[PDB]
């Protein structure tokens, strides 16, 4: 059936979100801001209420990188 109607769908998206955050922050920790933010914006994109996530990010990211993030939001 359509996405979301299967028990396994919620597990896949939680795993996807964790992966994307871990990958993004690893890439950021290497200096690859652009690809890191790509992954962070994928994580945000599957999150139904990303208010605190965005807040922490804007708190913690360099401001030109946060700007990049918004461009890719």
């Amino acid at each position: 059936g359509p996405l979301g109607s299967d028990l396994k769908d919620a597990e896949a998206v939680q795993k996807f979100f964790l992966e994307e955050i871990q990958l993004g922050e690893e890439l950021l920790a290497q200096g690859d801001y652009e690809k890191g933010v790509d992954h962070l914006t994928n994580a945000i994109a599957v999150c139904g209420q990303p208010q605190q996530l965005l807040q922490v990010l804007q708190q913690t990211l360099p401001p030109p990188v946060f700007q990049m993030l918004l461009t890719k939001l």
Partner: peptide
């Protein structure tokens, strides 16, 4: 560092 990811997870 890559465990920064735990902070982002805690935001939910």
């Amino acid at each position: 560092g890559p465990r920064l990811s735990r902070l982002l997870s805690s935001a939910g």
